Design a protein around this ligand. Sequence first.
Ligand SMILES: [Cl-]
Length: 424
Amino acid sequence: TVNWSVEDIVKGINSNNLESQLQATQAARKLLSREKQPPIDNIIRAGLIPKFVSFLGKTDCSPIQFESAWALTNIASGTSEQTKAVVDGGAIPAFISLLASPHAHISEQAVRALGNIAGDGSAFRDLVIKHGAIDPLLALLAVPDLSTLACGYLRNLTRTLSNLCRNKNPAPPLDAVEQILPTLVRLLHHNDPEVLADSCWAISYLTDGPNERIEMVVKKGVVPQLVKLLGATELPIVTPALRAIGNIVTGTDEQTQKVIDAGALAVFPSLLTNPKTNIQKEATWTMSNITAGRQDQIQQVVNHGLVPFLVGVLSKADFKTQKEAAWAITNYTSGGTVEQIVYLVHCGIIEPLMNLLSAKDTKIIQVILDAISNIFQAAEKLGETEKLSIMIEECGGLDKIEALQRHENESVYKASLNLIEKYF
Ligand SMILES: [Cl-]
């Protein structure tokens, strides 16, 4: 069945010989598994999807169920229009019936096919849910110990469940999320790196929304496990774990506190120096939504030794990361006590802050300028306003601020002039 033409496949599928149809379907499946440019569109144009879908129901002939399920899975893993062709052929209810197949390799294909369809987008996600996929999917995981399941099979179930958690506008139905979450919590404790990665992605999707979505997740007790995975060695795990934690700290101060209470801040020395740029970037963004919290939460950042790491990120990092660092400092200086803001200067924030004021980005400049203002405000409460003026002179900051009086932006000009006057 290697190297058939689409014309030969169609000839075999149009014979009314179940074994000839089986041969041709397998030929189609191998064509569609090809690495180089599989002829998905040619198979679709030939009108083969509805025949493949009808073969999903031939319970008398499990091999042709398998080959047609795999063929359709491959098509559904392509472009959105390709995925739509599969859905338009009636594949969704047929695949959901195949979840009850006694043949593990056949129910597995149906799991994968439904994951590919649900992962296309919110509409297909919700259509898969409306056809009732969740109950039969969760039943396949209703075992006392996940470790008795075949490794590849458990990974496909995890991947498919995370795709049912994925995408927004809208987010998934609340009742669907509640139904899935307990099984997701269990997968999040399973010791396979790929199951862990995909479960973390699932949690990152569910926490990417309003505070009530976050609370659903936080109430399940998963934050300690997320923090544990935040320290994993595998970057495919750390990345979604860090995303989930970062989402959770965009919520309320009480939700942020659960992350702190679980020990998250002790991982940030590594995260804020991580060789992977996006980890450093997302770790610094997370920090900024922690320094937007309460003064006792700022104080935890201090106690964990993280101000020097923020100074470090400001001084040298990818620019996008330095931008988040700037944000973290301004949030820190808006909400911090006077003692806390003084500590920040004593750690060296001023010189790296000044040096970023020469960046060809207008947003960061207004963020840095705001932070400088909030620091002076604290300097006033101590009268050491004079001494701060000097520091900013001694490192080239006054040169930088003077020129910003004359900037394309008006909010930039307003703030810079308002400072060169009020303090110099
Ligand atoms: Cl674990």
